[PDB]
Design an enzyme around this catalytic site. Structure first.
Site, PDB file in Angstrom:
ATOM      1  N   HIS A   1      53.040   8.870 -22.927  1.00 34.43           N
ATOM      2  CA  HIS A   1      51.772   9.417 -22.362  1.00 34.43           C
ATOM      3  C   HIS A   1      51.295   8.493 -21.247  1.00 34.43           C
ATOM      4  O   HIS A   1      51.361   7.268 -21.394  1.00 34.43           O
ATOM      5  CB  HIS A   1      50.738   9.709 -23.475  1.00 34.43           C
TER       6      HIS A   1
HETATM    7  C1  LIG Z   1      43.975   0.072 -19.022  1.00 33.88           C
HETATM    8  C2  LIG Z   1      44.649   0.766 -20.179  1.00 33.88           C
HETATM    9  C3  LIG Z   1      45.753   1.571 -19.977  1.00 33.88           C
HETATM   10  C4  LIG Z   1      46.402   2.235 -21.042  1.00 33.88           C
HETATM   11  N1  LIG Z   1      47.499   3.017 -20.773  1.00 33.88           N
HETATM   12  C5  LIG Z   1      48.085   3.627 -21.781  1.00 33.88           C
HETATM   13  C6  LIG Z   1      49.217   4.461 -21.539  1.00 33.88           C
HETATM   14  O1  LIG Z   1      49.689   4.674 -20.413  1.00 33.88           O
HETATM   15  N2  LIG Z   1      49.774   5.093 -22.618  1.00 33.88           N
HETATM   16  C7  LIG Z   1      49.340   4.917 -23.866  1.00 33.88           C
HETATM   17  O2  LIG Z   1      49.937   5.531 -24.747  1.00 33.88           O
HETATM   18  N3  LIG Z   1      48.273   4.137 -24.146  1.00 33.88           N
HETATM   19  C8  LIG Z   1      47.668   3.518 -23.149  1.00 33.88           C
HETATM   20  N4  LIG Z   1      46.554   2.736 -23.387  1.00 33.88           N
HETATM   21  C9  LIG Z   1      46.080   2.534 -24.760  1.00 33.88           C
HETATM   22  C10 LIG Z   1      45.538   3.751 -25.397  1.00 33.88           C
HETATM   23  O3  LIG Z   1      44.478   4.315 -24.621  1.00 33.88           O
HETATM   24  C11 LIG Z   1      45.064   3.300 -26.783  1.00 33.88           C
HETATM   25  O4  LIG Z   1      46.166   2.984 -27.567  1.00 33.88           O
HETATM   26  C12 LIG Z   1      44.256   4.368 -27.502  1.00 33.88           C
HETATM   27  O5  LIG Z   1      43.212   4.765 -26.618  1.00 33.88           O
HETATM   28  C13 LIG Z   1      43.667   3.884 -28.803  1.00 33.88           C
HETATM   29  O6  LIG Z   1      43.366   5.093 -29.562  1.00 33.88           O
HETATM   30  P1  LIG Z   1      42.381   4.980 -30.815  1.00 33.88           P
HETATM   31  O7  LIG Z   1      42.234   6.368 -31.377  1.00 33.88           O
HETATM   32  O8  LIG Z   1      42.855   3.780 -31.594  1.00 33.88           O
HETATM   33  O9  LIG Z   1      41.020   4.538 -30.137  1.00 33.88           O
HETATM   34  P2  LIG Z   1      40.267   4.921 -28.780  1.00 33.88           P
HETATM   35  O10 LIG Z   1      40.934   6.140 -28.238  1.00 33.88           O
HETATM   36  O11 LIG Z   1      40.209   3.638 -27.998  1.00 33.88           O
HETATM   37  O12 LIG Z   1      38.824   5.392 -29.323  1.00 33.88           O
HETATM   38  C14 LIG Z   1      37.695   4.505 -29.622  1.00 33.88           C
HETATM   39  C15 LIG Z   1      36.407   5.264 -29.387  1.00 33.88           C
HETATM   40  O13 LIG Z   1      35.421   4.906 -30.396  1.00 33.88           O
HETATM   41  C16 LIG Z   1      34.214   4.519 -29.778  1.00 33.88           C
HETATM   42  N5  LIG Z   1      33.592   3.479 -30.590  1.00 33.88           N
HETATM   43  C17 LIG Z   1      33.788   2.112 -30.508  1.00 33.88           C
HETATM   44  N6  LIG Z   1      33.076   1.449 -31.389  1.00 33.88           N
HETATM   45  C18 LIG Z   1      32.370   2.427 -32.076  1.00 33.88           C
HETATM   46  C19 LIG Z   1      31.439   2.353 -33.127  1.00 33.88           C
HETATM   47  N7  LIG Z   1      31.065   1.204 -33.677  1.00 33.88           N
HETATM   48  N8  LIG Z   1      30.916   3.517 -33.587  1.00 33.88           N
HETATM   49  C20 LIG Z   1      31.315   4.663 -33.012  1.00 33.88           C
HETATM   50  N9  LIG Z   1      32.188   4.853 -32.023  1.00 33.88           N
HETATM   51  C21 LIG Z   1      32.681   3.680 -31.593  1.00 33.88           C
HETATM   52  C22 LIG Z   1      34.579   4.067 -28.366  1.00 33.88           C
HETATM   53  O14 LIG Z   1      33.477   4.183 -27.491  1.00 33.88           O
HETATM   54  C23 LIG Z   1      35.734   5.018 -28.027  1.00 33.88           C
HETATM   55  O15 LIG Z   1      35.283   6.244 -27.463  1.00 33.88           O
HETATM   56  C24 LIG Z   1      45.904   2.068 -22.349  1.00 33.88           C
HETATM   57  C25 LIG Z   1      44.775   1.246 -22.553  1.00 33.88           C
HETATM   58  C26 LIG Z   1      44.148   0.598 -21.497  1.00 33.88           C
HETATM   59  C27 LIG Z   1      42.943  -0.270 -21.755  1.00 33.88           C
HETATM   60  C1  LIG Z   2      44.462  11.591 -23.048  1.00 34.75           C
HETATM   61  O1  LIG Z   2      44.668  12.739 -22.219  1.00 34.75           O
HETATM   62  C2  LIG Z   2      44.882  13.939 -22.843  1.00 34.75           C
HETATM   63  C3  LIG Z   2      44.062  15.044 -22.650  1.00 34.75           C
HETATM   64  C4  LIG Z   2      44.322  16.217 -23.340  1.00 34.75           C
HETATM   65  C5  LIG Z   2      45.407  16.291 -24.202  1.00 34.75           C
HETATM   66  N1  LIG Z   2      45.741  17.446 -24.961  1.00 34.75           N
HETATM   67  S1  LIG Z   2      46.462  18.807 -24.429  1.00 34.75           S
HETATM   68  O2  LIG Z   2      45.941  19.017 -23.113  1.00 34.75           O
HETATM   69  O3  LIG Z   2      46.240  19.798 -25.436  1.00 34.75           O
HETATM   70  C6  LIG Z   2      48.206  18.523 -24.292  1.00 34.75           C
HETATM   71  C7  LIG Z   2      48.674  17.972 -23.107  1.00 34.75           C
HETATM   72  C8  LIG Z   2      50.035  17.736 -22.926  1.00 34.75           C
HETATM   73  N2  LIG Z   2      50.490  17.169 -21.711  1.00 34.75           N
HETATM   74  C9  LIG Z   2      49.717  16.810 -20.660  1.00 34.75           C
HETATM   75  O4  LIG Z   2      48.494  16.781 -20.690  1.00 34.75           O
HETATM   76  C10 LIG Z   2      50.403  16.234 -19.496  1.00 34.75           C
HETATM   77  C11 LIG Z   2      51.740  16.113 -19.142  1.00 34.75           C
HETATM   78  C12 LIG Z   2      51.916  15.505 -17.913  1.00 34.75           C
HETATM   79  C13 LIG Z   2      50.701  15.173 -17.346  1.00 34.75           C
HETATM   80  N3  LIG Z   2      50.493  14.560 -16.187  1.00 34.75           N
HETATM   81  O5  LIG Z   2      49.473  14.902 -15.589  1.00 34.75           O
HETATM   82  O6  LIG Z   2      51.000  13.443 -16.072  1.00 34.75           O
HETATM   83  S2  LIG Z   2      49.345  15.602 -18.289  1.00 34.75           S
HETATM   84  C14 LIG Z   2      50.923  18.068 -23.936  1.00 34.75           C
HETATM   85  C15 LIG Z   2      50.478  18.630 -25.117  1.00 34.75           C
HETATM   86  C16 LIG Z   2      49.128  18.875 -25.317  1.00 34.75           C
HETATM   87  O7  LIG Z   2      48.620  19.418 -26.460  1.00 34.75           O
HETATM   88  C17 LIG Z   2      49.511  20.001 -27.410  1.00 34.75           C
HETATM   89  C18 LIG Z   2      46.215  15.188 -24.395  1.00 34.75           C
HETATM   90  C19 LIG Z   2      45.955  14.014 -23.721  1.00 34.75           C
END
Ligand SMILES: Cc1cc2nc3c(=O)[nH]c(=O)nc-3n(C[C@H](O)[C@H](O)[C@H](O)COP(=O)(O)OP(=O)(O)OC[C@H]3O[C@@H](n4cnc5c(N)ncnc54)[C@H](O)[C@@H]3O)c2cc1C
Ligand SMILES: COc1ccc(NS(=O)(=O)c2cc(NC(=O)c3ccc([N+](=O)[O-])s3)ccc2OC)cc1
Ligand SMILES: Cc1cc2nc3c(=O)[nH]c(=O)nc-3n(C[C@H](O)[C@H](O)[C@H](O)COP(=O)(O)OP(=O)(O)OC[C@H]3O[C@@H](n4cnc5c(N)ncnc54)[C@H](O)[C@@H]3O)c2cc1C
Ligand SMILES: COc1ccc(NS(=O)(=O)c2cc(NC(=O)c3ccc([N+](=O)[O-])s3)ccc2OC)cc1
Lengths: 489, 490
Positions: B462
């Protein structure tokens, strides 16, 4: 105190929302989800949709795409495109603007998902643990703040993600993280990215493309070679290709203090006594599980020595009805992993069909210029776990990169095998398309593909991907940890 | 006037010929002769040392389609806030061809170097034909009455002369060109007609479309209702819309009847429909015919198929024991990596006595259209005939970047066709940036008899378009004993 929710989710992130949505729409459960904003940006940055949507993968990709055009614009001359080279301007304000309405559209659709979904109910504010069956949503992170409501919960899912690690040094107040980088009003003429991990390298490329005239991007890393954990060939090759595209790598260098100069610029002293003047210092030295605001002290949920919520293979904390998925668990900090953990949990709990996430052979990518796509073990880790390891390696210049004038853009392909059965342990790729090539390699490793399954598949020509089907002879081996060109007779 | 005996004599220094020759020589230590009509790309014979792919195929077309992509990149960069003088933009065709010719020429010379440096692998300029079952005569030209350059004595003989553009016998065909001449046009055509619904017509449509001078136009005609016959139907319809969108006119159910020159030297075209069109170039790409005419297979009685290809069994064997055919001359799958695999399998069969045969099923292939295609295995229609119950998984989305770019039409499509009984993936069909690179490793998945569950239980990368393949768990519709439906009957 609200009526009985089947599940309460603290963090509307990649994990939370999968868990919530699956629990609600799939098993017909009543669900509460809690985050601190309904839209991206200051003050809290992460929001409804999680780190990925608001200040991670999604806006990053858009911004790395933006940065590629610097390369496309230059390379197009070889293929006989002609325009006014002096007229070229990189408008950072228009990128951020476009990036913000894209992210903003995602924010609003999640709001619509909650509006349209029966028994899936959103709650603004800061969730914490009162008792083993009660989440209290306060107005702020301060536990002494106004109570918005108490949620009664059969089961509780911690999913608050992670947060930028800032080193306690003098002037850390003058330095920023990825979070702030996403919202800089203008692009920095000079910038220091601190860290050798993926976020440092990615931002180094983004700033490198959008920097105003006579600008410069430096990246420092306290150790000898960037991108620890990645294939070593690729680490050395992506160093040379960032250098080649005008990024200075300072390895074995770490900031000791930052102080403001009289023009508001940032003066940086490295532990080596070296100095550097830059307009922005972006810390990307790690990400720490986000546990502080949950008051896990109340119900005695165990953290690991690391700082992550300790869990078993099924995302269970030591408190029976409480669970932790995602970056809070401080394992693979990826979006698709937090989503898999999310779904496996909800099927475990409300489906009584106990499923667990496989954290091995997970495909991942670095959206550096040029980018990386990897899946499974590096040769070093393989060499320790397996008695005999074969390494297949191929480097080549895609033919286009002769003509384009980006001759440095070498594509690298490595396959690491268990030489006993030719089972493929790992696949490591550097060059245009790597992130797309590796996805289906993920499925190959899931099927226990052997090196012979790769070289007996007919190539697609011309592609960089076909290199993976073109390697029949090991380049070198690791016999009981020791390297060599040939096996001993 | 005869040679010292060779283990193997190869007619055609192609993708297939050189793999066979190189493997025979360097691998099994055999003595090898390889015969082609030029040592570099271009007029008069166009194909040369290195084969059609190197000189007038995949290699130079890729370089050229890459060139045509900058038209899109330049325009799309505005949404990501890039600014330059839009009036100053010029596509210089002369520099593309020039750079292309330098790149192809460097390949030509390294094959010469490979022949120079390899023991028992010997190259021979000119036209090879079959004299006897143990003699290949190299003449100075295709004319069998031409000066003899030398006779090669041969234990075994390999026919690998590739294929050649099909031109329809219509009045004015002389005024028309093929892919071969397209690769050397001195200037890029203001108006061009590509004739044919296949991959060459589409690819060249995109190249001419990017490099056309101001007020220029590209028309592509196809005698039937929908272009790219053999490809997935959704993708066929979707690449029609995406070529149209980028300013290419598709004329379906239209075929040239005659071409005549106008008084300015331009080309006036009459369709069977009576429709007419004035264009600077007519490029015929209506098919490719096995190159058999110059081999004098009449001499030794090698059997051609009804089609026109050299008939062969699964091990590339003609009806004449020590004579073999691989590559496009066998008129089966006309891809470079397939001629290479046939080549290797033949040599290991013959000189290794380890009989191996090419698997012609589940071959990954691509189309370098804008946007591109990557496919592997059966379309749902062929599957529906062979399998009692077929499921189809389908997903169409606009990569987020193509909101911002202003190319909102650039829909990415993913289709998986399964045997619904065991969920065995029969085929995978992709349209959009990266498709040719995504499909390679899908090739290996199909080799390993992957099921739909192996895809959707792999954790996505992703954000990528490739992770859509791992995001489809419910069939969209089914084919029960050939008949379509949304749901299975209870
Ligand atoms: C710069 C950057 C680039 C990245 N690029 C990638 C990538 O290319 N591909 C990839 O797979 N991953 C990537 N990641 C990491 C990916 O986004 C994380 O692994 C993922 O977002 C974590 O998912 P999660 O469900 O653990 O938490 P998150 O999706 O981080 O959700 C946490 C949420 O809970 C909220 N929250 C925090 N504390 C509290 C609280 N006390 N009470 C209520 N809500 C709270 C926050 O505001 C936030 O909205 C990247 C991260 C960063 C920082
Ligand atoms: C964290 O950001 C997200 C927002 C929405 C969703 N959910 S979703 O829209 O339902 C969804 C998306 C995809 N694939 C893409 O979004 C792309 C491919 C290439 C892209 N590109 O732009 O590089 S985007 C595949 C499955 C799927 O659901 C089954 C996920 C992640
Ligand atoms: C425009 C175009 C684009 C293509 N794009 C792709 C693509 O992207 N991917 C792909 O996989 N395939 C592609 N192909 C197909 C691919 O080029 C062929 O399948 C491949 O070249 C076949 O190899 P071969 O050894 O059978 O024949 P060739 O590679 O054609 O080699 C035959 C050689 O024999 C020589 N020859 C002919 N007659 C004689 C004679 N009597 N004596 C001596 N030499 C002789 C010719 O000069 C030629 O060099 C493309 C084809 C074309 C025309
Ligand atoms: C048809 O013109 C060629 C002539 C000879 C060769 N033979 S080769 O160069 O030795 C060779 C190449 C590859 N892969 C590449 O060619 C590419 C990757 C990305 C590309 N591309 O640019 O996107 S091309 C794989 C194996 C291999 O043999 C060991 C190839 C091609």
């Amino acid at each position: 105190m609200s009526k009985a929710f089947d599940l309460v989710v603290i963090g509307a992130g990649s994990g939370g929302l999968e868990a919530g949505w699956n629990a609600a729409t799939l098993y017909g459960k009543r669900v509460a989800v809690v985050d601190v904003q309904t839209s991206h940006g200051p003050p809290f940055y992460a929001a409804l949709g999680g780190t990925c949507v608001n200040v991670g993968c999604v806006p990053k990709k858009l911004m790395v795409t933006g940065a590629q055009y610097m390369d496309h614009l230059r390379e197009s001359a070889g293929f006989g495109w002609e325009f006014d080279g002096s007229s070229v301007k990189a408008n950072w304000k228009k990128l951020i603007a476009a990036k913000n309405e894209a992210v903003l559209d995602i924010n609003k659709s999640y709001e619509g998902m909650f509006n349209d979904t029966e028994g899936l109910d959103f709650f603004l504010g800061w969730g914490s643990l009162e008792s083993k069956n009660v989440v209290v949503v306060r107005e702020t992170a301060d536990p002494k703040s106004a109570v918005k409501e108490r949620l009664q919960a059969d089961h509780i899912l911690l999913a608050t993600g992670s947060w930028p690690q800032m080193p306690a040094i003098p002037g850390i107040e003058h330095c920023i993280s990825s979070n702030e980088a996403f919202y800089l009003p203008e692009p920095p003429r000079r910038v220091l990215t601190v860290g050798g991990g993926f976020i440092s390298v990615e931002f180094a490329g983004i700033f490198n493309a959008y920097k105003p005239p006579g600008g410069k991007v430096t990246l420092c890393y306290r150790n000898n070679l960037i991108l620890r954990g990645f294939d070593e060939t690729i680490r050395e090759e992506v160093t040379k290709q960032l250098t080649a595209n005008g990024i200075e790598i300072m390895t074995n260098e770490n900031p000791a203090k930052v102080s403001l100069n009289t023009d508001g610029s940032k003066h940086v002293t490295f532990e080596s006594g070296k100095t550097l003047d830059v307009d922005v210092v972006m810390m990307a030295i790690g990400r720490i599980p986000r546990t502080n605001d949950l008051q896990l002290g109340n119900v005695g949920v165990k953290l690991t020595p690391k700082g992550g919520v300790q869990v078993d293979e099924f995302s269970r904390t030591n408190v029976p009805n409480i669970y932790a998925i995602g970056d809070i668990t401080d394992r693979l900090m990826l979006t698709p992993v937090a989503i898999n953990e999310g779904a496996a949990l909800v099927d475990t709990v409300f489906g009584n069909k106990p499923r667990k996430t496989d954290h091995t052979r997970v495909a991942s990518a670095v959206f550096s210029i040029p980018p990386i796509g990897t899946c499974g073990l590096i040769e070093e880790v393989a060499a320790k776990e397996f008695e005999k390891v074969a390494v297949y390696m191929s480097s080549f210049t895609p033919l286009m990169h002769n003509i384009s004038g980006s001759k440095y853009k070498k594509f690298v392909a490595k396959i690491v095998t268990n030489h006993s059965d030719g089972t493929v342990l790992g696949v490591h790729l550097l060059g245009d398309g790597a992130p797309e090539i590796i996805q289906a390699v993920g499925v190959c490793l899931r099927l226990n593909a052997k090196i012979s399954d790769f070289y007996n598949t007919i190539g697609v020509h011309p592609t960089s991907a076909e290199e993976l089907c073109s390697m029949r002879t090991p380049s070198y081996y690791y016999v009981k940890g020791e390297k060599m060109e040939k096996l001993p007779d």
